[PDB]
Design a protein around this nucleic acid. Structure first.
Lengths: 49, 144, 158, 99, 139, 56, 114
RNA sequence: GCGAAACAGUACCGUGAGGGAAAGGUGAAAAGAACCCAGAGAUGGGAGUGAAAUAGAUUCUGAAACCAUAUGCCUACAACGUGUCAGAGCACAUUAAUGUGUGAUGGCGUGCGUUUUGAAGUAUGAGCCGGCGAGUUAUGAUAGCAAGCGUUAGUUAACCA
RNA sequence: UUCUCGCAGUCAGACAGUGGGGGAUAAGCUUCAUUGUCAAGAGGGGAAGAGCCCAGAUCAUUAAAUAAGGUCCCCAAAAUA
RNA sequence: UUGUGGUAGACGAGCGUUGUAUUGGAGUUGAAGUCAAAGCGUGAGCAUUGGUGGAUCCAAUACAAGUGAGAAUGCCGGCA
């Protein structure tokens, strides 16, 4: 093509934005649960735990 | 879609009728009067416009009542004051405002609305038999 | 960042008897003081890894698609002498070939001073070297002009 | 006049040359379209329908109703769905409904 | 009509100003000047100056009768007031608002000064729809 | 005592409705010039037909 | 590079506040109250969109039954006159509009006599 | 955006250490409203200036809330999250459309997020408007998708130009 | 509804019928199991009700037939014996 | 044919904005911002015109986000 119609070849993927929007959820809850460190900042406790 | 239901608009009609309830059951007369005022019996009824017809009753002090409700049913009136309630029996009301008791019963049988305030004031119930409301030429009949 | 703060870490408010928010800091990002946790920083890569095989394949494809073009005519040594350091001759040549609005690019490898001296009076005229031009400038060139001798060597370059 | 005409799945009482509204028929404006699913015309009574009597309407316009912005929200829950409905209609009148 | 009388940010509480100028609105100049000259409120003198200036301007600048003019409308536009800190018990401070407002009145000498606004609005809508239809005239 | 919630503007209009003021008396000076208030001494320093003080 | 969030957000607030129209006092000057009123109005609109059909049907039945009673029968009797013999597709509303042209619905009544 | 767009580490606070703010915009050029009127004047209204003075020194534009004003609607017997669907009546003629504005009345109806066993709740928080305001980046690994290359594969780090 | 990979979420559940235990066959009580409802789904009837009875609703329509449930009036619909 | 009750949760597909890269246009006979209107969409939205206003903006394709504001007795300013 050229730099007036350039398009990918279906190279475009979704992005789970945890901060914005409500139509796909992905907002306040942001898929982290409702309680515990997993639902809080600096979660994901040590893999060996 | 819609059929565009035609209904009367800005129209008024209020005929006059009268009966005598000497020895007649209260309930039937009451429901017939409710039908007359609410306009269910009419076939062009419009709720938000004129509904009722002027109503007069003569000699409402000879009502009949089955059973011992004269000493079984009691009517109460409690004022805003503490303990300000008075209770009256059926036989006592027979020499008291039974016409106003009929008034209250039929207004209770009407739908609750501010039109009911204007509906019920068209009812003129008299314990006696003589009044000047006959000057409007009420239609004498039965089952009103 | 949050290291740009000024003052102590003392609480501006009291632990109790406060009918307001927590507000345990002085120059919070949600406060007017600022200091957002996120923002552009001058330490990212801004580039990634690519392989020469695909680059050469794409470059050869662009060479093919530009040889398929019309206004890609040959250039040689004779007109380098026939042109001078004067901008006049270049403009006369462009007018005689209606290359005014065209973005035509010139290819240089002998590094003639006359060519590089010119191509500065219009926003569409410029000259580039064979090893100093990439796929974009090859195709943004919009039917450029290329030398003659080097092409066979360029054939080996894919 | 008086004529009961069943358009779509709803009945309408019409008289001589009355412009009224029904569901859209997906037809060019200006033509004449006949309907036979007609009852109660010319003081004639049929049980399912009537024969020898048909209606002939002309199409005047195809329009839409207002934006029916149906919005569904559930209190204290993560659900808020918005939509705007514009439903087509045809304005038409009968010309020479036969009896 | 014309000959409005503006005034920029005189110290006055708008609450009392609205009431006093609604008392004085509607009537003519003299029959109202005499009554406002005896108004027990302090705001009257400040408004008195404004109305004397207004009638003087109407007579001089506009050449109107002045006698048949009357107060068509009063408005007391609130301007940026003052805010001052006063110490208060238990070690507190209180921000008291010193109130001032812009005073301006309208003078009318006709059965009008109301319809012309309607005509202007109708003309505005007329040119709006003219532009809309000229856009719709595109072929 | 603080309110449960802030008072409405129409409630403010109701509060100030009965706070509306009226006019006051007026009287033409039977001896002096321009109008004055009833049962008052005129700017001419006199009660009606009663010179008692200088105007200024 | 930073982006200012004034213009599009302002337009969004403008259109949302313009969605709310026909309200009293402090109900068309704030985002929250306007949004709540819009949602309640939409729910009311749908519920009323069904209840209007229900109420029209109820009123049609009421006045049709009144017409039958002044002609001397009840609502259920007329159904038998149609359902049990030669069912017709006549609408209750249309039979109710037949009152506007009287002495014609009575022709139907005398026709369905059985 | 350096705290500092300026007389900014300023004013101010705290004895002292120390803490620590904000605020820009005339007009092409002041050609900065001579002069007249009301007043004591600021100022306000005219004239003039300037293309233009809703460009007059509160001098780029002047939103929302807030306040004052008036065209029309209706209302002082009215039990109502102030709204919805019908609906007379009143006033006009419209982003040309079975028009709008408003709604006497009829039909119906107890907010928003959080938390949960459930919140219309006498659970929680919000006076309001406007602006600001929280999933990025570096490195490493895993997986998916797409592409290139490949049959003794693919790939260059640092670095040199 | 077997299996591999990926995101999960989750051990505060509640209630109703039934089998129980404790408790006092008292509990809008507790703890186990079965079926069902709400959470996680609005409505109709029971007058009002999260859990009861029907069922699972794209939207629009001024259609009907019906289900649980009801036909003296308030509130649409019956009377006969 | 199944269908379109819907939490957390997940997949699918879009819209708007800022700036950049190419490509194109419009602009005191008038750009943005701005309000107003009885417009157009399955949606993030899309326009036209009026006037305040007086200088740059927009169309389509991609590129990267300090890219999307109702709550946090969120922060500040102002107003009750």
């Amino acid at each position: 093509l050229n730099q007036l119609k350039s398009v990918p070849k279906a190279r475009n993927h979704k992005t789970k934005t945890l901060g914005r929007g409500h139509g796909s959820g992905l907002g306040k809850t942001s898929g982290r649960g409702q309680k515990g460190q997993k639902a809080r900042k600096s979660g994901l406790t040590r893999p060996g735990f | 879609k819609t059929s565009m239901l035609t209904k009367e608009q800005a129209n008024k009609r209020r005929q006059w009728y009268i009966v005598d309830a000497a020895g007649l059951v209260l309930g039937k007369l009451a429901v017939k009067a409710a039908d007359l005022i609410r306009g269910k019996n009419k076939v062009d009824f419009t709720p938000n416009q004129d509904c009722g017809d002027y109503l007069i009753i003569i000699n409402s002090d000879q009502v009949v009542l089955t059973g011992n409700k004269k000493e079984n049913e009691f009517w109460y009136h409690h004022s805003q004051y503490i303990g300000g309630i008075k209770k009256v029996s059926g036989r006592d009301m027979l020499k008291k405002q039974s016409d106003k008791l009929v008034y209250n019963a039929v207004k209770g049988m009407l739908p609750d609305n501010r039109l009911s305030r204007r509906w019920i004031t068209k009812v003129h119930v008299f314990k006696g038999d003589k009044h000047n409301m006959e000057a409007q030429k009420p239609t004498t009949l039965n089952w009103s | 960042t949050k290291g740009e703060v000024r003052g102590g870490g003392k609480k501006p408010y009291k632990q109790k008897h406060t009918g307001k928010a927590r507000q345990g800091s002085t120059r919070n990002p949600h406060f007017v003081g600022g200091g957002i946790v996120f923002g552009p920083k001058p330490n990212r890569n801004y580039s990634l890894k690519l392989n020469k095989k695909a680059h050469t394949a794409a470059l050869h494809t662009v060479w093919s698609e530009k040889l398929a073009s019309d206004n890609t005519h040959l250039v040689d040594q004779n007109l380098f002498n026939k042109t001078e350091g004067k901008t006049k001759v270049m403009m006369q040549f462009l007018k005689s070939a209606k290359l005014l609005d065209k973005n035509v690019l010139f290819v240089v490898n002998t590094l003639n001073t006359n060519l590089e001296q010119s191509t500065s009076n219009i926003k569409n005229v410029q000259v580039k070297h064979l090893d100093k031009v990439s796929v974009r400038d090859l195709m943004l060139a919009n039917a450029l002009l290329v030398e003659k001798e080097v092409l066979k060597a360029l054939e080996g370059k894919f | 006049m008086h004529a009961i005409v069943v358009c779509g799945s709803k009945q309408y009482l019409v008289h001589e040359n009355d412009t009224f509204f029904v569901e859209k028929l997906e037809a060019p404006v200006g033509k004449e379209i006949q309907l036979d699913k007609v009852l109660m015309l010319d003081e004639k009574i049929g049980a399912p329908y009537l024969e020898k009597a048909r209606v002939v309407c002309v199409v005047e316009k195809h329009g839409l109703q207002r934006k029916v912005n149906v919005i569904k929200h559930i209190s204290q829950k993560h659900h808020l769905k918005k939509y705007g409905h514009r439903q087509p209609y045809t304005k038409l009148k009968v010309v020479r409904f036969v009896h | 009509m014309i000959a409005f009388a503006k005034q920029f940010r005189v110290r006055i509480s708008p609450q009392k100003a609205r009431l006093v100028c609604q008392l004085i609105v509607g009537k003519k100049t003299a029959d109202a000047q005499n009554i406002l000259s005896n108004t027990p409120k302090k705001a009257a003198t400040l408004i008195a100056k404004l109305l004397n200036s207004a009638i003087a301007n109407a007579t001089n600048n506009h050449g109107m009768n002045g006698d048949a003019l009357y107060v068509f409308e009063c408005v007391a536009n609130q301007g940026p007031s003052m805010k001052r800190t006063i110490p208060r018990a238990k070690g507190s401070s209180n921000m008291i608002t010193k109130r001032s407002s812009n005073l301006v009145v309208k003078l009318s000498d006709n059965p009008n000064e109301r319809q012309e606004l309607i005509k202007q609005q109708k003309a505005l809508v007329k040119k709006r729809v003219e532009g809309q239809q000229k856009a719709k005239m595109a072929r | 005592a603080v309110q449960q919630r802030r008072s409405s503007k129409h409630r403010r209009d109701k509060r100030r409705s009965h706070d509306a003021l009226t006019a006051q008396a007026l009287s033409v000076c039977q001896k002096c010039g321009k109008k004055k208030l009833f049962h008052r001494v005129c700017s001419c320093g006199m009660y009606g037909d009663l010179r008692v003080k200088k105007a200024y | 590079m930073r982006i200012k969030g004034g213009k599009q957000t302002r337009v969004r607030r403008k259109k949302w506040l313009k969605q709310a129209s026909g309200s009293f006092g402090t109900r068309h000057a704030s985002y929250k109250v306007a949004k709540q009123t819009v949602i309640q109005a939409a729910k009311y609109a749908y519920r009323d969109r069904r209840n209007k059909k229900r109420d029209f049907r109820s009123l049609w039945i009421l006045r049709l039954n009144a017409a039958l009673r002044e002609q001397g029968m009840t609502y259920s009797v007329f159904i038998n006159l149609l359902k049990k013999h030669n069912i017709e597709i006549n609408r209750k509303v249309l039979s109710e509009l037949a009152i506007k042209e009287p002495s014609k619905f009575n022709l139907i009544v005398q026709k369905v006599k059985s």
